[PDB]
Amino acid sequence: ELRFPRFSQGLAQDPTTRRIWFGIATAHDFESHDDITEERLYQNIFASHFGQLAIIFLWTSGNLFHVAWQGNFESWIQDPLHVRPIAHAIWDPHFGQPAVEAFTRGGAAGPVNIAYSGVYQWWYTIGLRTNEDLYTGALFLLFLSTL
Amino acid sequence: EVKIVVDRDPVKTSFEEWARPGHFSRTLAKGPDTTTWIWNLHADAHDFDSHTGDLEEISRKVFSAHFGQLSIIFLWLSGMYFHGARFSNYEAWLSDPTHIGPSAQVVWPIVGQEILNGDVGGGFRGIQITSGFFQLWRASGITSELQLYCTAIGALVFAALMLFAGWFHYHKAAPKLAWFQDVESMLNHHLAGLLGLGSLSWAGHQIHVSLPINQFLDAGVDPKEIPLPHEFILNRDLLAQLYPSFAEGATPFFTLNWSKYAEFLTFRGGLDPVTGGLWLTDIAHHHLAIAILFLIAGHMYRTNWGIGHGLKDILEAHKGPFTGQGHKGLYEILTTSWHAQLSLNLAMLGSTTIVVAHHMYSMPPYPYLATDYGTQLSLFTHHMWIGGFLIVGAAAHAAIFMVRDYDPTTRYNDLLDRVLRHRDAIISHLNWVCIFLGFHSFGLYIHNDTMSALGRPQDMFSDTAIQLQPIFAQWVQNIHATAPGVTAPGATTSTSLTWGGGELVAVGGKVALLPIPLGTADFLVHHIHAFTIHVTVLILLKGVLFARSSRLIPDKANLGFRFPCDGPGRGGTCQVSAWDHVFLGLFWMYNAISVVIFHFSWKMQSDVWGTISDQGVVTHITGGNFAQSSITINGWLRDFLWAQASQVIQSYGSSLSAYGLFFLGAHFVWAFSLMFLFSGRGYWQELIESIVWAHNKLKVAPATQPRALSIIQGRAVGVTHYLLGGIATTWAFFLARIIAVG
Amino acid sequence: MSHSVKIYDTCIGCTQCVRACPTDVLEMIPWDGCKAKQIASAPRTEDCVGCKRCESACPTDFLSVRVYLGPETTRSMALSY
Amino acid sequence: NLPSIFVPLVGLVFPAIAMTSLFLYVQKKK
Amino acid sequence: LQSKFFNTFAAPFTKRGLLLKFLLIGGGSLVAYVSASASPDLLPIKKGPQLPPTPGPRGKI
Amino acid sequence: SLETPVTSSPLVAWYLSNLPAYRTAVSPLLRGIEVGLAHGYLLVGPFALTGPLRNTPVHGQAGTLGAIGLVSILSVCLTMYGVASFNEGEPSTAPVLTLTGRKKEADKLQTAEGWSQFTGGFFFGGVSGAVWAYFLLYVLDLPYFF
Amino acid sequence: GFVPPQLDPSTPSPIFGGSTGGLLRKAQVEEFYVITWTSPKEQVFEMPTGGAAIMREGPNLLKLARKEQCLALGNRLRSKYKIAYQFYRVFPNGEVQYLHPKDGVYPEKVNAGRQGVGQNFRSIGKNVSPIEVKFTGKNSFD
Ligand SMILES: CC1=C(/C=C/C(C)=C\C=C\C(C)=C\C=C\C=C(C)/C=C/C=C(C)/C=C/C2=C(C)CCCC2(C)C)C(C)(C)CCC1
Ligand code: SF4
Ligand code: SF4
């Protein structure tokens, strides 16, 4: 290939910039690549599915850990109808004092936004109660992603 | 020399052709094998230059077309004057114009639209108007429905006469070439004859009819017993009673002591508090001086005699060092190609329409005009739109000339040759200026909005924060407010009142004009205007300069003016014809005009218009939040766009309800445009194919073979629908809002 | 070889393409499969720019000369810089 | 605390090194 | 005269790969340290809101 | 091509030929450090005076450190462009013909190693120019307005 | 093939001021083109990339960036003034190549001697579906 991209020789001979562009759109594609066969295609499909699952698992692990480190679940139990949820702490070096003012809500020690993804009702319906539960779940999910 | 040579009876008035469509185009006359024929028929009707090869016949044809146009204009004027006569409340409006809404259109009570005939005061019911005829009809002292009636009759007569003249001059006595191509005498006349004598005769009609009756009405009289106009010229003693000098016949004029007439011809300036309008003495002096100026200008060029210049004898002298030979031969180009003249005249006419729009609001000529808010607003925005359209047309036809009738072998020039020789430099530098202006005029708004939403107001761009001052504008305003002191002693006040010095003119508890201050918001909006104008100029100038041949396609010109593309080759060659350049530039001109008119509306309703209290405290229609809420796009949404859109949206179940309905259809079409602008053709062709199958199955397949519109026509219908939607939306918004609140 | 040209035996040897080829790609050669005893040929597909104007002319049943697209190059793209 | 360490890193320096690495890559010529 | 000083006081800064390494690691370390050692007087973030906030509609939630 | 007085004149060609980016009679590293100190003295002004801490007595050091950071970023960009476009043993691509036609030695400034010397010089010079502008703006600072 | 080239010489150029339509870096690094013809009389003609200029008597020599512009100008010269012409390609090594006629006779008409590069002896409908040829180098039109 002698240069990017490594999957289509026809592109590599494009001194026009569109090379880079089509060096992105036609990467995941497998039929159009050069020197591709059936069983190779299937093994690639398998590796890609594993990667996708790794991504999903890391995503949900991050959800859990962030709630566990800055969320409100524990003290949200005591009144799920008068204490808004919390998503994650704000650290924005572009704010002014009134910004920091109008974001510290729901009973926190800094600017935080309200978690709207419904994850609290989910993790509360099954019956979880403490931040330690969330830590354990996050560790398990992270190890599963690595696996 | 120059004579009256014409020809006799080329074409006979025979209906032989009306039953055969497309007689002009050889291909069209054969027959509609498909459905695209009936699009192509209308598409090239007026395309005169593609019907012959000699300029004589197309010149005759355009001579007749001008008569057609004038006949339509006269018929429109006649309809206007009629509807003023037989269907208005004009007399009641003249009784007292302070708080009586001009209405000149009633609707038939058939389908529930009686509500349209809303309450307009003065014992009348009718759709309120904003055309602004009434200020004119009060300036010209019409003051009687008989006058409107007879004027409509005379307009109809002139319309039929012009239509005749048209028919006769094309069919019977066709002018020849040496007549048309003779521009010297045409300039001579139109300078001296048409414009000058026009303004002179109008000064006549003003000093002998309008001025006295208007002064009487300002004194305050029922126009019933106001003396008729002719009874002001026949018996001199009336005008004698008014103006002592005017009872001296013609001695003080001929004997060069003109100062006697100083009473009715003067140079006061300013406005007239009795009506906020202009001192009719001033406008009369203006029209008369202008008449004299045009008359003395008209005598430039040699036509038949031995005096005077020649438009060939003027250009060739000018030849500078850098450019070289100068304008040599250009006279031949601008005399042998109609499209060139059409472009030049359309450009100048658009510019004049824009400057008329501007000069209107800041110097209300008519009486009781700067207090009928909707009229002023609607007039200004209409003139702005017309100017924009004319300019775009100018650019398009300039491109058409560049393609077809330009040729160096015989229509040579050494100036345009140089211009084209370095087109790349022009387009490159204009492009870079466009980027620079875009950044430093819109990113400023973006920064201001962001630093607002981040709770850092003291890092904003305003008067209360990091400050940008339009110092040159305030400098010029100061100069214009201190100029009547020394430089122009013959004046009384500033040329207008909008200059930053003086007092305010208010009639009937409402204000008409007062000083206008400029804040940082004005700086920003002015730079937005400059940027958008520069981008439109970039688009259109690139189209014109590259209509001949580009570095992408070598022989573009041979492919013609209007063609869709040059195939998907060489990486795709979509939209390379100058026609598509104009198609693009149209949207940007629309955007420029839209932002300009929005700015105007907000600035007026936030710093000038409004009401005045009994004590003298002013409470403007919107509260004067411009300099503090025009500097955030979110502001534009909140303070102006959302807020002032109330009156159109609650408008159901009221007189203004029509303005409500359009506010949706305007949007709707506006949508609809996308369907044509986004899609292509082949898809629609296949869909039409399947539909033709479904029909043919039932022995219904029409011989006029269905065909999805051609590409260029698709783009055309798209851009037309889009312009219609946008302009209708802003139209409904403006009318509903201003006529409800104001 | 950047783009690709193909010609099919429905060629009626009318010779409109060559007259309309912008960059001197096609030509005619003696054949025996029409009156004109001449068929197209594309031995200069390097300079084939890719505009369909050639096959926008062939007045046959559906077509007789096709222009199949492929990869890109410096000359197949009308580059001049 | 820890945000002040990490957010600036994943905002400026890590994206910078990623961008320059991918620049170097796509500009390769073997 | 000045050439020798300009050469010697920027002599190790000539190798290019080494230059990328040094600039990148130094920039990272510097920004991390200055942000971790940011003083609250010049940054409205390194300190909290320090005022009692507003409750949302419908009581507090 | 067209040759206007702008692109072709004694004084303009003289000026453009005298600035360091074309005086091939000097080592490339020295031209690099010269342009670097030039831009270093250049950029400190607006960055400091109009920064987001201008209303604070620290605005000086703030603007200067920001200028230094921008200089470092651009030096990174220079080195990256050089390693991208310049190979390590291949010839130069500099204009080797002057206006008259004197066949010029291939400008060592337009070499991989030469571009590297240029980048290093520019970075060091930018740092020096920034700190010099600081020391001349906040110690010996009477005859200016800021 | 008794159709030899002509080995483009260095003959004078048309009279033209020189403008922003000339060559760029590309021509100086990769390749450019030169068109050459003999003229019957000093007349005026519009260059492809802007404006117009005059030609001289005898042989001419014009340089250009891409072959398309050269051939467009050549077709203009053949349809406007009825004169023949050639155009050559140049490489920075110093090579010169002869491109357009390849025999002297226009490619517009028949001239035996040309091979048959790129024919398929089957109507267009006979082409096959990509599934029959997938996972190979071949394609339907081959
Ligand atoms: C009844 C009917 C129907 C339906 C219909 C519909 C549904 C319609 C719609 C419609 C829509 C949904 C919308 C619309 C819209 C419209 C419009 C929108 C129009 C306009 C017009 C005009 C004429 C305008 C004008 C103007 C303006 C205002 C601006 C500028 C100036 C001027 C004056 C030009 C059916 C089918 C059942 C059947 C048939 C009949
Ligand atoms: S692409 Fe079609 S048109 Fe363009 S050259 Fe090759 S053949 Fe002639
Ligand atoms: S395709 Fe049409 S044009 Fe080309 S050869 Fe066959 S027939 Fe002649």
UniProtKB/TrEMBL annotation, chain A:
Q: Intact protein stretch covered?
A: 2 to 148 of 734
Q: What does this protein do?
A: PsaA and PsaB bind P700, the primary electron donor of photosystem I (PSI), as well as the electron acceptors A0, A1 and FX. PSI is a plastocyanin-ferredoxin oxidoreductase, converting photonic excitation into a charge separation, which transfers an electron from the donor P700 chlorophyll pair to the spectroscopically characterized acceptors A0, A1, FX, FA and FB in turn. Oxidized P700 is reduced on the lumenal side of the thylakoid membrane by plastocyanin.
Membrane-spanning residues where? Answer: 134-147
Record-listed chlorophyll a 3 binding positions: Y116, S117
Q: Please state what the protein is called.
A: Photosystem I P700 chlorophyll a apoprotein A2
Q: Where does chlorophyll a 4 bind?
A: W122
| Residues bound to chlorophyll a 1 | H88, W91, D92, H94
Q: How does it assemble?
A: The PsaA/B heterodimer binds the P700 chlorophyll special pair and subsequent electron acceptors. PSI consists of a core antenna complex that captures photons, and an electron transfer chain that converts photonic excitation into a charge separation. The eukaryotic PSI reaction center is composed of at least 11 subunits.
Q: Which domain of life is it from?
A: Eukaryota
Assigned protein family: Belongs to the PsaA/PsaB family.
Please tell me where chlorophyll a 2 binds in this chain.
Answer: W91, D92, N113
TrEMBL record, chain B:
State the compartments where it is located: Membrane; Plastid, Chloroplast thylakoid membrane
Binding-site positions, chlorophyll a 8: H208
Name the UniProt key words of this record, in alphabetical order.
4Fe-4S, Chlorophyll, Chloroplast, Chromophore, Electron transport, Iron, Iron-sulfur, Magnesium, Membrane, Metal-binding, Oxidoreductase, Photosynthesis, Photosystem I, Plastid, Thylakoid, Transmembrane, Transmembrane helix, Transport
Keyword Oxidoreductase tagged: yes
- Give GO MF terms, alphabetically: 4 iron, 4 sulfur cluster binding; chlorophyll binding; electron transfer activity; magnesium ion binding; oxidoreductase activity
So where does chlorophyll a 4 get bound?
A: W108, Q113
Q: Where are the transmembrane segments?
A: 146-168, 342-362, 382-404, 425-446, 523-541, 582-602, 656-678, 722-740
Q: Which InterPro entries match?
A: PSI_PsaA, PSI_PsaA/B, PSI_PsaA/B_CS, PSI_PsaA/B_sf
Residue numbers binding [4Fe-4S] cluster: C565, C574
EC numbers on record: 1.97.1.12
Q: Name one GO cellular component term.
A: photosystem I
Could you tell me the membrane topology recorded for this protein?
Answer: Multi-pass membrane protein
Query: Which positions does UniProt annotate for chlorophyll a 3 binding?
Result: Q105, T130, S131
Q: Which family does it belong to?
A: Belongs to the PsaA/PsaB family.
HAMAP family tied to this protein: PSI_PsaA (MF_00458)
Biological role stated in the UniProt entry: PsaA and PsaB bind P700, the primary electron donor of photosystem I (PSI), as well as the electron acceptors A0, A1 and FX. PSI is a plastocyanin-ferredoxin oxidoreductase, converting photonic excitation into a charge separation, which transfers an electron from the donor P700 chlorophyll pair to the spectroscopically characterized acceptors A0, A1, FX, FA and FB in turn. Oxidized P700 is reduced on the lumenal side of the thylakoid membrane by plastocyanin.
Name this polypeptide is given: Photosystem I P700 chlorophyll a apoprotein A1
The species is Hordeum vulgare subsp. spontaneum
Q: Which gene is transcribed and translated to give this protein?
A: psaA
From TrEMBL, chain D:
Q: What Gene Ontology terms for biological process does this UniProt record contain?
A: photosynthesis
Q: Which UniProt keywords apply?
A: Chloroplast, Membrane, Photosynthesis, Photosystem I, Plastid, Thylakoid, Transmembrane, Transmembrane helix
Q: How does it sit in the membrane?
A: Single-pass membrane protein
Q: Where are the transmembrane segments?
A: 2-26
Say where the protein is mainly found.
Answer: plastid
Please, which domain of life does this record's source organism belong to? Eukaryota
Q: Does the keyword ATP-binding apply?
A: no
This protein's GO cellular component annotations are: chloroplast thylakoid membrane; photosystem I
Q: Where in the cell is it found?
A: Plastid, Chloroplast thylakoid membrane
- Assigned protein family: Belongs to the PsaI family.
Q: What does this protein do?
A: May help in the organization of the PsaL subunit.
What is this protein's name? Photosystem I reaction center subunit VIII
Q: Provide the gene name from the record.
A: psaI
Describe which stretch of the whole protein the shown chain covers, with first residue, last residue and complete length: 5 to 34 of 36
